[PDB]
Design a protein around this ligand. Structure first.
Ligand SMILES: *[C@@H]1O[C@H](CO)[C@@H](O[C@@H]2O[C@H](CO)[C@@H](O[C@@H]3O[C@H](CO)[C@@H](O)[C@H](O)[C@@H]3O)[C@H](O)[C@H]2NC(C)=O)[C@H](O)[C@H]1NC(C)=O
Ligand SMILES: *[C@@H]1O[C@H](CO)[C@@H](O)[C@H](O)[C@H]1NC(C)=O
Ligand SMILES: *[C@@H]1O[C@H](CO)[C@@H](O)[C@H](O)[C@H]1NC(C)=O
Ligand SMILES: *[C@H]1[C@H](N)[C@@H](C(=O)O)[C@@H](O)[C@H](O)[C@H]1O
Ligand SMILES: [Cl-]
Length: 597
């Protein structure tokens, strides 16, 4: 592209910037407690600053069995505990037959039983995690009721309404604070998608199966719309459906709309080279910027989820719609699993640095102003100080993305003119850059000859490309102004982080834990919930076999694979935050690790 001017005015905070994109999801195949999944959700929960919050999970109610009605919740307990351990919430689709029990939602007895199952499970988890926590969950209907083969379950139009009423009453009986929505489907033009449009009319005007009341609770409306490789198309399609909802159903004018399957392209398992690397990452940011700049900044849009928490399959470790790249290394004894962080997951960590107020910004090319429906765009945020562990911040995230198309020839000259940064102590800036040249684990894999079972050393070389290229903190010029002139590739992401120096140093890393990978290798993962500030250079890790630093390139991602040359991993580990002014936080409580022949 021709040169782009990107202006950001830090003195001009316009309105809130809600972090509406912090969701992923997946469908188990016909698993959720496997070691593979345990590693996967550790990667998902390791996005800093709760950058991913929800995991929308299909078939949760196939993790419950019945007797008689009694319910065995053992498997469901295991999955929800695993999300909880990783600071994640279920996108709780009320989806499953309870291992064959439910077959017909026009059978009155089954409808009552469904309500009891939903009451029972809700009360259980309110008891297990607390009401405050469970009230944050998006309980949702069965996935895509108009595009699903219900098979051994009979789910008619009326059945779906009966089912819904049982979901709603089941949750109500447990607590009125619990949230329910649906249908989680595309809303094709009537007379298509009868169960989806039918749900809305039923909730607007229909009769409640249990109470006879006119209308039924619907806390949010969830749709699914994908891009067919176009980013802007997602937004376009959402607006058409939201307008039809608004016109047909006056009561839903302020009802929140979710797009909880908002992917570039339908079909997660289809190999696509652009899914492997920064191409997918930059498009995801582009879609988000489009939503903030062209919609939210007036339909009541509240949530966007990229449905990309699936585990990839041989022979396509990198090329599927996944946050991680899975390698089932079958030539070791015993065989083991390794995951790599793909650029899309790393990108969610850059988005996570965006703060609560949107700053004025303008992108232009030779004086023509361009909105986010273009290949180059920006999201800029500012943060107002909380306490003494906090201070003023600005985060500027620039994308260069031609959707699913990557051209190795293609670059863009950007001039970033940041002004209006308020006076503050120890002002510094840090840049983080991602492109396919420097930061593609898939690139490194292909350069090594695409080994199906990479060696330990080969895995090290691939992982070295996971993190962005980071420039050390530099002091900001006086007058609160900064001009940068980066060359950006297409695709690429550039985050410019400007921080004032908090009075106190970082807080403590917590919930350190170690997941075994194989002999001589483990994953360390931790929480940043008490660290306080986002102005972090790295997490210093120490190992006592006393304590010595594990030297590594800077990384703010809350997970590290330890794979020393020696295979000596027995001992204890501890982790602490290091800020932009070289001040450490307190070390986490340490975690022991013992390999036993
Ligand atoms: C290493 O061992 C594992 C055994 O766990 C092998 O995993 C299996 O890999 C195949 C893919 O080559 C998977 O089959 C695929 O399933 C999907 C979804 O149903 C389907 O779309 C594909 O066409 C294909 O049938 C299979 O699910 C998977 N099984 C498990 C339990 O993970 C892996 O292939 C072995 N690696 C090598 C190189 O032999
Ligand atoms: C519940 O299911 C689990 C695992 O599937 C099993 O270990 C447990 O014994 C079951 N409890 C029953 C049948 O009461
Ligand atoms: C985005 O730009 C294209 C032309 O490049 C235009 O046809 C489309 O309508 C635009 N969409 C929006 C929502 O601005
Ligand atoms: C939505 C979608 N049809 C699927 C896909 O695109 O692969 C997947 O994202 C999800 O499991 C479906 O509900
Ligand atoms: Cl996709």
């Amino acid at each position: 592209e021709a040169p782009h001017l990107v202006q950001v005015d830090a003195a001009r905070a316009l309105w809130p910037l809600r972090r509406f994109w912090r969701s992923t999801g997946f469908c188990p195949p016909l698993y959720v407690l496997s070691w593979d999944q345990q590693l996967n959700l550790a990667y998902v929960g390791a996005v800093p600053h709760r950058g991913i919050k929800q995991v929308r999970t299909h078939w949760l109610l196939e993790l419950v069995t019945t007797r008689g009605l009694s319910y065995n919740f053992t498997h469901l307990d295991g999955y929800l505990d695993l999300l909880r351990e990783n600071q994640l919430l279920p996108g709780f689709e009320l989806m499953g037959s309870a291992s064959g029990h439910f077959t017909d939602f026009e059978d009155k007895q089954q409808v009552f039983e469904w309500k009891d199952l939903v009451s029972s499970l809700a009360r259980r988890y309110i008891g297990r995690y607390g009401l405050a926590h469970v009230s944050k969950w998006n309980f949702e209907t069965w996935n895509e009721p108009d595009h699903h083969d219900f098979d051994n379950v009979s789910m008619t139009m009326q059945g779906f309404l009966n089912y819904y009423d049982a979901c709603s009453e089941g949750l109500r009986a447990a607590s009125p604070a619990l949230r329910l929505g649906g249908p989680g489907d595309s809303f094709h033009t009537p007379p298509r998608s009868p169960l989806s449009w039918g749900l809305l009319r039923h909730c607007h005007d229909g009769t409640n199966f249990f109470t006879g009341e006119a209308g039924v609770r619907l806390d949010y409306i969830s749709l699914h719309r994908k891009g067919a490789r176009s980013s802007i198309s997602i937004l376009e399609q959402e607006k058409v459906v939201a307008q039809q909802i608004r016109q047909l159903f006056p009561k839903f004018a302020d009802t929140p709309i979710y797009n909880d399957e908002a992917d570039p392209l339908v079909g997660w398992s289809l190999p696509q080279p652009w899914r492997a690397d920064v191409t997918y990452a930059a498009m995801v940011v582009k879609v988000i910027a489009q939503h903030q700049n062209l919609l939210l900044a007036a339909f009541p849009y509240a949530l966007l989820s990229n449905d990309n928490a699936f585990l990839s399959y041989h022979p396509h470790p990198f090329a599927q719609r996944t946050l991680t790249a899975r390698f089932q290394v079958n030539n070791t004894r015993p065989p083991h699993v390794q995951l790599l962080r793909k650029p899309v997951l790393t990108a969610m960590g850059l988005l996570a640095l965006l703060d609560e107020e949107q700053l004025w910004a303008e992108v232009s090319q030779a004086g023509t102003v361009l909105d986010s429906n273009h290949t180059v765009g920006v999201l800029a945020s500012a943060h107002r100080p909380q306490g003494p562990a906090d201070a003023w911040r600005a985060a500027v995230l620039i994308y260069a993305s031609d959707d699913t198309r990557a051209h190795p020839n293609r670059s863009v000259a950007v001039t970033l003119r940041l002004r209006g940064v308020p006076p503050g102590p120890g002002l510094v800036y840090v840049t983080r850059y991602l492109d396919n040249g420097l930061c593609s684990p898939d690139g490194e894999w292909r350069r090594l000859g695409r080994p199906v079972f990479p060696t330990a050393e080969q895995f090290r070389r691939m992982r070295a490309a996971e993190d962005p290229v980071a420039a050390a903190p530099r002091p900001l010029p006086a007058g609160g102004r900064l001009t940068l002139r980066p060359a950006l590739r297409l695709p690429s992401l550039l985050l410019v982080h400007v921080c004032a120096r908090p009075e106190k140093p970082p807080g403590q890393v917590t919930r350190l834990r170690a997941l075994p990978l194989t002999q001589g290798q483990l994953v360390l993962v931790w929480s940043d919930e008490h660290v306080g500030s986002k102005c972090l250079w790295t997490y210093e890790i120490q190992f006592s076999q006393a304590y010595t630093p594990v030297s590594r390139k800077p990384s703010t991602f809350n997970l590290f694979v330890f794979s020393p040359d020696t295979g000596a991993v027995s001992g204890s580990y501890r982790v602490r935050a290091l800020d932009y002014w070289a001040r450490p936080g307190p070390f986490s409580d340490p975690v022991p690790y013992l390999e036993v022949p």
